[PDB]
Curated annotation (Swiss-Prot):
Quaternary structure (record): Forms a large corepressor complex that contains SIN3A/B and histone deacetylases HDAC1 and HDAC2. This complex associates with the thyroid receptor (TR) and the retinoid acid receptor (RAR) in the absence of ligand. Interacts directly with RARA; the interaction is facilitated with RARA trimethylation. Component of the N-Cor repressor complex, at least composed of CBFA2T3, HEXIM1, NCOR1, NCOR2, HDAC3, TBL1X, TBL1XR1, CORO2A and GPS2. Interacts with ZBTB33; the interaction serves to recruit the N-CoR complex to promoter regions containing methylated CpG dinucleotides.
Domain SANT: 10-61
Phylogenetic placement of the source organism: Eukaryota, Metazoa, Chordata, Craniata, Vertebrata
UniProt record similarity statement: Belongs to the N-CoR nuclear receptor corepressors family.
Residues spanning the membrane: none
Role description: Mediates transcriptional repression by certain nuclear receptors. Part of a complex which promotes histone deacetylation and the formation of repressive chromatin structures which may impede the access of basal transcription factors. Participates in the transcriptional repressor activity produced by BCL6. Recruited by ZBTB7A to the androgen response elements/ARE on target genes, negatively regulates androgen receptor signaling and androgen-induced cell proliferation. Mediates the NR1D1-dependent repression and circadian regulation of TSHB expression.
Signal peptide coordinates: none
Post-translational note: Ubiquitinated; mediated by SIAH2 and leading to its subsequent proteasomal degradation.
Domain description: The N-terminal region contains three independent domains that are capable of mediating transcriptional repression (RD1, RD2 and RD3). The C-terminal region contains two separate nuclear receptor-interacting domains (ID1 and ID2), each of which contains a conserved sequence referred to as the CORNR box. This motif is necessary and sufficient for binding to unligated nuclear hormone receptors, while sequences flanking the CORNR box determine the precise nuclear hormone receptor specificity.
Descriptive protein name: Nuclear receptor corepressor 1
Locations listed in the record: Nucleus
Length: 61
């Protein structure tokens, strides 16, 4: 990983590995806090991450 910013100029709106890692990184510290986890992920919003929490915690009751 030498080249920092290769390009990816195209607008890509999809949860990527890099993102996921961040979603959890903070979660551990400030769990149940979408206000922060979102602050870091500018590309994403507050009410945008709240969903993920469910997706990962979606079971059949």
């Amino acid at each position: 990983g030498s080249s920092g910013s290769s390009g990816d100029r195209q607008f890509m709106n999809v949860w990527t590995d890099h993102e996921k890692e961040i979603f959890k990184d903070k979660f551990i510290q400030h769990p149940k806090n979408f206000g922060l986890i979102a602050s870091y992920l500018e590309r994403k919003s507050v009410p945008d991450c709240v969903l993920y929490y469910y997706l990962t915690k979606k079971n059949e009751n």
